[PDB]
Amino acid sequence: TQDFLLERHKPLTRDYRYKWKYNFRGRWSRRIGKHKPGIRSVEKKIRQRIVRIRKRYMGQRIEAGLPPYVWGGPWPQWGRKRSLFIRGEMYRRMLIYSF
Amino acid sequence: TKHNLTYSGRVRAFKPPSAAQRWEMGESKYAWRLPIPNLLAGDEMQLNPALRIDESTTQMFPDFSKPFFHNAHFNFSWKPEEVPFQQTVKLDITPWRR
Amino acid sequence: SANPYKPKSREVFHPYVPAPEHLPPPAYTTAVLKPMQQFIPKDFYRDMRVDSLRDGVSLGSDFPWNVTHKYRFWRRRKYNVQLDDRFIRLSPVTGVDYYPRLNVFAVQWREDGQHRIRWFRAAYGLTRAMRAAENFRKTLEATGRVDNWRTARHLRQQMLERRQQLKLRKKRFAKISSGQF
Amino acid sequence: GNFRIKPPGVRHAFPKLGTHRMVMFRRMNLLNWPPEDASPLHPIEPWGRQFFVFNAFATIDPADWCGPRGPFPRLPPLAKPAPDAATLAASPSSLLSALRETEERSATRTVMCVTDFAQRPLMFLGKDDFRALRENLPRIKEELKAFKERIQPNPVHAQYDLRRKLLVYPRQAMQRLKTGEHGGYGTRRGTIRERKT
Amino acid sequence: RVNYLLNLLNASRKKIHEQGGDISRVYVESYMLNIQGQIKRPQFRLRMVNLIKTWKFAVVLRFREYPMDEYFHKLFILKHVPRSLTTDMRLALAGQRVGLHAVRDWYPFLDSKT
Amino acid sequence: AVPKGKRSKHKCKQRQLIYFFDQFDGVFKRRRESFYRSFYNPPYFSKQTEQTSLPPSVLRPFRFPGFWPGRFAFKMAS
Amino acid sequence: NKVRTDKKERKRAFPQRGFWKKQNFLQVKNNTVRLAFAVQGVDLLKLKRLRWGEVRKGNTGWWTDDYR
Amino acid sequence: TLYWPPTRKDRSKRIRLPSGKKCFVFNAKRDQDGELEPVLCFVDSQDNLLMWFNEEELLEFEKLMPRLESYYELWEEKASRTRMVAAVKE
Amino acid sequence: GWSKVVNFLNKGVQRRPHRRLPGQPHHQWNMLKTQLDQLVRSDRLELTLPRAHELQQYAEELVHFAKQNTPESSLIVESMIFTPAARRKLFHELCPLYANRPFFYTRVVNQHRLRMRDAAPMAYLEFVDRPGEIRPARPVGFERKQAIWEEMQATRRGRRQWWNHAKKLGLIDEETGDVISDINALRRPSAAEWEESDSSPSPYKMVAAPKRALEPFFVDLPPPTERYRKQRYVFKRFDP
Amino acid sequence: MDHPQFPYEPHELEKMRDLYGVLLKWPYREQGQVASVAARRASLESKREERLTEVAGQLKVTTGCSDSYVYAPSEMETGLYREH
């Protein structure tokens, strides 16, 4: 540890050229997204890029004709409403009315 | 170009369901297995729908015991019994209470 | 808002739907289902599978897929997948909520009768902000700054400063309780 | 992707939504590919490389080849020329067909084609190459196993953690929500109101 | 918008060549501008309505074919040589499209120093 | 702030000449020099104008026949 | 509108640096048209790209010229 | 030393197929992220890359191999019959 | 405007080491990386003169670090590049091609013409020593040694002018004091060649061709640059 | 495999931000190396505890030859929904 602190080292990659602290929205800048003025987070950026990669892979399998398999692990819940079951109940009522 | 194009500002073509897709006077999806249709077919027609599968569009059959999409090869609004029991998940709307 | 006009129960309701009161028995009830003597009328299954949904209890082992005919949702149905049960922005810690317009996690509590709220900006990270809010709430609970979660020790400790303030008030209004003025 | 040229009906009978839209927009460039007599394409996991077998067109003898020309040298096919203008005029064929007649080629060279997920060709193998690979298979598995052991995890994963532990890491402020006349004090208070009933 | 002037010049050169003038000794001696008008468009602003103008103009050019004596006195005696001609000479010499005698042949007109 | 009087024709002419010299020495001389230096290379051939343009060429014409000492054309073959 | 009764000419009295080209939407539409033609054996893009007086049968071009 | 062409010790003994093509095993920078992984590589008679197979890809290819032999046989018969047609039609 | 204001406002001003592209720094870095990937894939790009001058340094950095062949340099190149096609092209073609080139793998050529639409000066940025390059690349290594040896033997002026450098290069024979006779004696294996430690009648034998071996059969497919194509620009109609 | 699941754990967010150009080309990694997915898996396993050869799937054959099949009612008027 002391040897490291004594030695001068170099950046691992070139990713420091992003200069993320300058990825900002001004006070009077037009609202692009839901970002408040100041430095913008990168969580949404990373999520969207990963979505693009996953979509590319799945579409590639579709084109190739590989079996229609999916990742089985834990899918997070992104919504609160039980739309599936509420709509199912509505459909049940409509069918009863037709009968 | 035929009906593959709309000749107006319409972007998305709307077409009502076809007569064969309707139920009354529609095509039964299991009639190809019946005696009379096969008697009338002779050697002019083959009624098995497996013969009309487009090789460049359909995917390989998956294992039913593993995660897979319903839209690949079923093409109907019900769950085949050969697919194993599925888990019904009900949202936990008030986690703080427990 | 937690209105007094919302329903008590938060479940999904499936009411019992009665048929018009004067209709005779439906057609499919004329079927004879003895194995030795069978007669299955027209539209037997069509009528009976919809009549079975009437009571609102026997919704079907595959509900709502047994009444969802549109292929828009069947095209999206997956099999043999494991799904979560909790919306990602809900915390199990009481008093933690999310304000989306401000992009903050709020902790709301009561301390000495007053209603107090603190903000935790989520731009630094959703998980970080939510965990900071939960930690703040638990720290308040532990230190006894939440009334309903206080302990006997917290009540005893707070009673000392309560007594000091009450003695100050008594000295403030001494001249009235004595009979002078 | 082997459309049906001049098909029945008035609308495309194949899916055109989602990834299928771009699939068809890609396949419409190469109506002649894959070849008409080609075997069924068989894909493999995980990247969807495909194999199929077909008879290719014979080429001229290289000794007669005039040589390479242009950015993409190629051997001309061995093709029988189309009938001449005089012959076509004397024939009973219509002007449309007469104009549309082309050369005749010989599809007599059996070969296997390996393609990617999009049927783009990658490599062609004859029966002799296929059999040689099949014979050499067992040693290839041993070589794969041996070269697997040379794998070492990337060092950046540990280096990043070390630098995080030992170096200064600034964390700038974000989301400084601005106030109006009334300033901020770190906490908010809810008002008390008595019922007017 | 200089494409208009370029079209006029190209057409004039072609016309003179077709009529038999020596393009090599045709000079632009003078010009004349003649207004034709201006098309006006409304421009709506905070407190007033303005009118923005697009001009309409005509250009008359006077070309003159110098007699051979004047051409000689200009190019050879006064060394007032077209830069297009000098560039063509230099390109020919650089590309070796002419013989070595061309250097002394074109010395009176080649470069500023010569 | 606004002008207190109309600028005269004399001063407008002066401004015309001054702006001419400014634009000349700032833009036009440089552009002409670059244009004449570009002649030492084959003319640019835009691949987006293939449908209507001539085939690519390298030769640049000598445009003053009265100063050409060489041959102008080759005799017809047989 | 086509009858030029609107006030859309008012903005066009002021300069703008540029305008969106809607190339994604336009290319989707163009490729839909191309697919409709191609399912019947027509190379609309090739026809559009042909030079005046140029004849190219099948999917041929400069590369065919090079290798033939 | 360069990553490509792999040096002596960075690759196995090259198999020479009876068409001028060679195949060997080495660790290649995979297309997904460039991380090294052992692949069965393929080159032409002039030592230009054609493609490579991962271990899983190679195992699936081996699984499918016997069927491709039958395809070879059938299409060889088809090519022979086309040759016969050409001979009959001069 | 007025042209002399450029002089007036630049009196006493330094040139920026990096030309700044539009947008924020992350966008600028993404743009530079994307254009570097495209330059690798195409071997040459028609750009504006400033943009070529700006992207040249990143192209040089990419080649320099790709040649080193260490995990650290590999990660640097990975941080610089986006696409698998660019990665494959770089590592399998440019690195062997530049194995003996110490540095300076690219060039910028000023077209000396202004773009029609917006009067933007134009230039090319291209990797050196590739087929179709604007001008021929000079040799490096033993090839350079051979070129200098030939120049020395051509004339006495060449011998005098390369005499001292030839001593360091090893082209001078110490025994006789003259230039060596067999330049082939200085040949040594290069990294671009396949080390031979691994040490015709087939119906499908590959045929020799200048760039890639050719198959002895024909497949009706255009070249990859022509297989898939689309209209370069679909017209957007004016809405009056 | 697994890839990071939004919302990301702060360390994951922070590392991916610092190594955007390297770690986001192929974010797939073996099970257990992604904290976001591992935590969700563990929570689901705990909730489960609190609560308490590969062959292609095929639909069974629906055709026949015997008299029992040939002379059986077509049941087209009956409203059978599970057509197959």
Short mmCIF file of N, CA and C in Angstrom, two decimals, chain A residues 70-72 75, chain B residues 63-71 74 76 78-80 83-86, chain C residues 62 65 74 76-82:
data_model
loop_
_atom_site.label_atom_id
_atom_site.label_comp_id
_atom_site.label_asym_id
_atom_site.label_seq_id
_atom_site.Cartn_x
_atom_site.Cartn_y
_atom_site.Cartn_z
N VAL A 70 -36.19 -17.58 -23.05
CA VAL A 70 -36.01 -16.31 -22.36
C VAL A 70 -35.21 -16.52 -21.08
N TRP A 71 -34.58 -15.44 -20.64
CA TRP A 71 -33.97 -15.40 -19.31
C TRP A 71 -35.05 -15.64 -18.26
N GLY A 72 -34.79 -16.55 -17.33
CA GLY A 72 -35.81 -16.97 -16.40
C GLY A 72 -35.75 -16.32 -15.03
N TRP A 75 -37.56 -11.16 -12.55
CA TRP A 75 -38.02 -9.97 -13.24
C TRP A 75 -38.52 -8.95 -12.23
N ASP B 63 -38.13 -26.52 -25.19
CA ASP B 63 -38.51 -27.43 -24.11
C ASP B 63 -39.59 -26.77 -23.26
N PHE B 64 -40.70 -27.49 -23.05
CA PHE B 64 -41.83 -26.91 -22.33
C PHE B 64 -41.53 -26.68 -20.85
N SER B 65 -40.50 -27.32 -20.31
CA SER B 65 -40.17 -27.20 -18.89
C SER B 65 -39.29 -26.00 -18.58
N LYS B 66 -38.96 -25.18 -19.56
CA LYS B 66 -38.00 -24.10 -19.42
C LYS B 66 -38.60 -22.81 -19.97
N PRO B 67 -38.06 -21.66 -19.57
CA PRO B 67 -38.69 -20.38 -19.95
C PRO B 67 -38.74 -20.20 -21.46
N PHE B 68 -39.93 -19.90 -21.97
CA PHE B 68 -40.10 -19.69 -23.40
C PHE B 68 -41.36 -18.85 -23.66
N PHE B 69 -41.42 -18.29 -24.86
CA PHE B 69 -42.52 -17.43 -25.26
C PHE B 69 -43.71 -18.24 -25.77
N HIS B 70 -44.92 -17.73 -25.51
CA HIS B 70 -46.14 -18.38 -25.99
C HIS B 70 -46.39 -18.11 -27.48
N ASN B 71 -45.95 -16.96 -27.99
CA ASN B 71 -46.29 -16.55 -29.35
C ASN B 71 -45.57 -17.34 -30.43
N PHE B 74 -47.86 -21.37 -30.81
CA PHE B 74 -49.19 -21.77 -30.34
C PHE B 74 -50.30 -21.12 -31.16
N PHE B 76 -52.93 -19.36 -30.57
CA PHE B 76 -54.31 -19.40 -30.10
C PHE B 76 -54.34 -18.85 -28.68
N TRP B 78 -55.18 -19.79 -25.57
CA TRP B 78 -55.32 -20.69 -24.43
C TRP B 78 -53.97 -21.34 -24.15
N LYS B 79 -53.89 -21.98 -22.98
CA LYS B 79 -52.64 -22.58 -22.51
C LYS B 79 -52.69 -24.08 -22.72
N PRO B 80 -51.79 -24.67 -23.52
CA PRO B 80 -51.79 -26.13 -23.66
C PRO B 80 -51.51 -26.82 -22.34
N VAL B 83 -47.85 -27.67 -21.21
CA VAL B 83 -47.02 -26.70 -20.48
C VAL B 83 -47.27 -26.88 -18.98
N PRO B 84 -46.22 -26.96 -18.16
CA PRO B 84 -46.43 -27.29 -16.74
C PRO B 84 -47.17 -26.18 -16.00
N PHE B 85 -47.50 -26.49 -14.74
CA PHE B 85 -48.22 -25.55 -13.90
C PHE B 85 -47.46 -24.23 -13.79
N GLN B 86 -48.19 -23.13 -13.93
CA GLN B 86 -47.60 -21.80 -13.90
C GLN B 86 -47.91 -21.12 -12.58
N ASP C 62 -57.17 -20.54 -14.37
CA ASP C 62 -56.24 -19.76 -15.18
C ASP C 62 -56.67 -18.30 -15.30
N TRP C 65 -56.76 -15.39 -17.82
CA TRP C 65 -56.46 -15.86 -19.16
C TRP C 65 -57.61 -16.65 -19.78
N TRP C 74 -51.71 -12.49 -25.06
CA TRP C 74 -51.15 -13.82 -25.22
C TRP C 74 -49.80 -13.77 -25.92
N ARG C 76 -47.64 -11.68 -25.39
CA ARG C 76 -46.69 -11.25 -24.38
C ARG C 76 -46.55 -12.24 -23.24
N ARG C 77 -47.49 -13.17 -23.08
CA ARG C 77 -47.41 -14.13 -21.99
C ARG C 77 -46.14 -14.97 -22.09
N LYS C 78 -45.44 -15.11 -20.96
CA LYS C 78 -44.27 -15.96 -20.84
C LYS C 78 -44.59 -17.15 -19.93
N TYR C 79 -43.76 -18.18 -20.03
CA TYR C 79 -43.91 -19.39 -19.24
C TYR C 79 -42.65 -19.65 -18.43
N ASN C 80 -42.83 -20.30 -17.28
CA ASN C 80 -41.72 -20.77 -16.45
C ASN C 80 -40.76 -19.63 -16.13
N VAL C 81 -41.32 -18.48 -15.78
CA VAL C 81 -40.55 -17.32 -15.36
C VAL C 81 -40.89 -17.02 -13.91
N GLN C 82 -39.93 -16.45 -13.19
CA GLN C 82 -40.12 -16.05 -11.80
C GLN C 82 -40.23 -14.53 -11.75
#
